Structures are given as C-alpha cells and as structure tokens.
C-alpha cells in the first residue's frame, strides 16, 4: 500500500545484509518487519523492530538470526505512529541462495558380475540412502519445481541415467518409503531409442513411473550420443525430446549429457531444446547467475561402494 523495502546487494555467498525502507508517506516512529522463511511457514515468523528513522528504518539482517538457514525469506512491513496506530506498508522477499545437490545414479541392482561394477548401487543400499533423505528432512524435487529450490528445506534432486529396467527397483523403493510425510520424486534420463528395448524401461514401466507422481521422465538423448563428436543435433536432442513427450504425455525440459561430455557448441545446441542440462562435473549446484549455468549443472556421483556416511557427507 505504501513504501518500498530494499536491502544492500547480496550474492550467492552472502550471509547478511541491511534492510531499509523508502518512499513512506505516513509519519512514523517505528517500522516492524515480520519475517519468516518460506520453507518453514508463516506460522514461524518473528517480528523485528527498527526505530532508526534517520537511517530509513535500517534493520540488520543475518541468516544467523534464523538458525543459519538460507533460501527465501518473506518480509511484511508495518509502520507505527507516535500514538501507537499501526499502518500497513508493503511486502517483499530476500533470497539467500541455497545449494542444491543433484545426485547421479545409474543401475539399481545387486551386482552379479555383469556390467560396470561402479555403476551398480544395490536396492538395499539405495533404500538406506533414500531413508537418510527421509529421516533428515530433505525435500526431493524434479525440474518442474526448479522455481521452488529456495522455498523448501534441504532441496535435493535424485536423478538416474539411461533408463535401465532395473530402475524399477528404485521406483519400488521410493513407493515403499513414500508416506504421509515423505513425498519422494526423482528424474529419469531416458536413452529414448531404448524404450521397450531388452534391458531398458518399457512403455508400461514409464507410464507406471510417471502416473505415480514419483518420476519426471527426461532426456538422455536418442542414442546416448557423444555430443561434441556428432552433427545430428536435431535427431539426438530435439527429436528425442519430442518422442519422449509422446510417450509420457508430460513436457520434457531437461537432459543429461552422455559421458558428461560438453563444450560451448554442445551447450548452444542444447539451449535450443532444453531448459536444464546436467554434467558429470562433481559438486553441488548453486545459483550464481552465470551464463547458461542451468545447462552446465554439476552432479554428485554415487558409487557401488558409497556408504550412507559418504552419501551424507557428499550432500549435507
Ligand atoms: Zn548415460
């Protein structure tokens, strides 16, 4: 209704700032800022008062005042007159960017000597890892909720590469762990030409995974192409997306680069067709506002030998 909330510029590395108000029309003795973390809910709000009238009702803000937590904080300001009358001012928000681990799995199966050992995580160990997420308040997301990474507690993306049939084991584990509190979701990056192939997810598997609300079915190209070395970008990137959309009935907005192989040319081609692209560069993503950063997203590799302790250290 009146006034404008501003704050000293922050970056993704910032932990604090100072809030100010300008353009106030009423005469005030005090401004009260009601602040809460979106992720924790308005019911958890506190109110912080400034009587620094000569300094635009300056209010120091530090994430230390909110248990060291980050993400989006909502701000509602009211003014107080000398006689105590309250005056509605305005609302805004400030976001301290949260890190987002993007986990990379391949096979979820008991290894029996067939295939590349490191790329197998047993269903038992996968369950233990997912149970860790469940027990520690992580919010599992898919790229349809990219806009929510700062609006939830402990955002994390569980992803699988290739569309192996054994990923139905991961699906079943997630169905088991799902309950009134834990709402798991995950991304499957499907080698699109392998739908219904021996060893891969079938059309019926994909429909079950998608219809359950658990899986977001995204692209791993048409043939798992070494993108810097191919020229058929429409076939590998565009037509794979289109074919997969016809199968799932849901938008395809994300891809994973086969082998983690990517260069500026590949990013530019990918940008034509996908909003999101993940690499195999190790680490957690954070929003830096860097050019095409969402098409160069780091991932955390899970190994055959990864323990729950190692898993926890790599995401926390
Ligand atoms: Zn792959």
Residue numbers in the entry: 45 to 360
Study text:
BA0330 and BA0331 are the only lipoproteins among the 11 known or putative polysaccharide deacetylases of Bacillus anthracis. BA0330 and BA0331 from B. anthracis are predicted as lipoproteins and putative PDAs and share 55% sequence identity. BA0330 and BA0331 interact with peptidoglycan, and BA0330 is important for the adaptation of the bacterium to grow in the presence of a high concentration of salt, whereas BA0331 contributes to the maintenance of a uniform cell shape. Our data suggest that BA0330 and BA0331 have a structural role in stabilizing the cell wall of B. anthracis.
We next determined the crystal structure of BA0330 at 1.48 Å, which revealed two domains. Apart from the closely related BC0361 and BA0331 no other CE4 esterase studied so far has an Fn3-like domain. Part of the expressed protein (residues 24–44 of the N terminus) could not be determined in the electron density maps, and therefore the corresponding region was not built in the model. The CE4 domain resembles that of other deacetylases, containing a well formed groove with the zinc atom located at the bottom. The electron density at the binding site was attributed to the zinc ion, which is coordinated in a trigonal bipyramidal manner by two histidines, one aspartic acid, a water molecule, and an acetate molecule, probably present as a contaminant to the PEG solutions used in the crystallization buffer. One of its oxygens interacts with the invariant Asp205, which is tethered with Arg343 (present only in Fn3 domain-containing deacetylases), whose guanidinium group overlaps spatially with the corresponding group of SpPgdA-Arg364. Interestingly, Arg345 is found in place of a conserved aspartic acid that is believed to be responsible for tuning the pKa value of the catalytic histidine (His150).
